[PDB]
Amino acid sequence: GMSDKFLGTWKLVSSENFDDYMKALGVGLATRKLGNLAKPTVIISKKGDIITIRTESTFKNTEISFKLGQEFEETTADNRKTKSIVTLQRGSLNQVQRWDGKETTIKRKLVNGKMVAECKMKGVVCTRIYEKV
Numbered sequence: 613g614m615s616d617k618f619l620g621t622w623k624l625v626s627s628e629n630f631d632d633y634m635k636a637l638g639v640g641l642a643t644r645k646l647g648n649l650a651k652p653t654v655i656i657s658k659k660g661d662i663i664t665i666r667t668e669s670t671f672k673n674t675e676i677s678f679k680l681g682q683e684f685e686e687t688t689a690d691n692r693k694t695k696s697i698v699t700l701q702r703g704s705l706n707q708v709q710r711w712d713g714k715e716t717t718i719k720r721k722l723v724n725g726k727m728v729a730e731c732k733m734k735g736v737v738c739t740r741i742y743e744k745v
């Protein structure tokens with residue numbers, strides 16, 4: 613299953629190309645401004661085979677709980693209603709969100725003890741690096 617090394621609290625320390633990623637998702641200017649200033653904490657926890665990813669920031673909090681390989685209904689930080697799934701690939705925790713015929717992926721992987729989230733939409737690639745805190 614998911615490596616226990618994902619478990620804990622993570623703080624954003626670097627974000628590359630988030631503005632263009634949000635644009636690809638259809639997020640408007642005023643929301644993007646606040647999104648670009650946000651430095652969220654991401655808390656990853658488990659209970660049995662249910663994994664929870666909680667995001668906390670001044671602007672927006674989100675939480676998803678899921679079992680690997682089992683599609684679920686998600687409400688994203690920008691209030692998209694998606695059909696989502698999370699699965700593993702070579703230890704990477706990989707999320708797909710699907711709505712209105714569109715799709716975006718968020719792949720979270722451990723790299724030298726840091727958590728790297730690669731967010732892709734329509735050719736746009738955003739990389740967000742987290743320190744464990």
Ligand SMILES: CCCCCCCCCCCCCCCC(=O)O
Pocket residue numbers: 634639643646647648650652654667668669671672673688689690718729731740
């Ligand atoms: C909670 C931070 C984002 C706040 C701004 C809302 C605009 C839409 C953001 C959608 C993508 C959320 C980031 C997922 C990738 C990650 O966990 O680093």
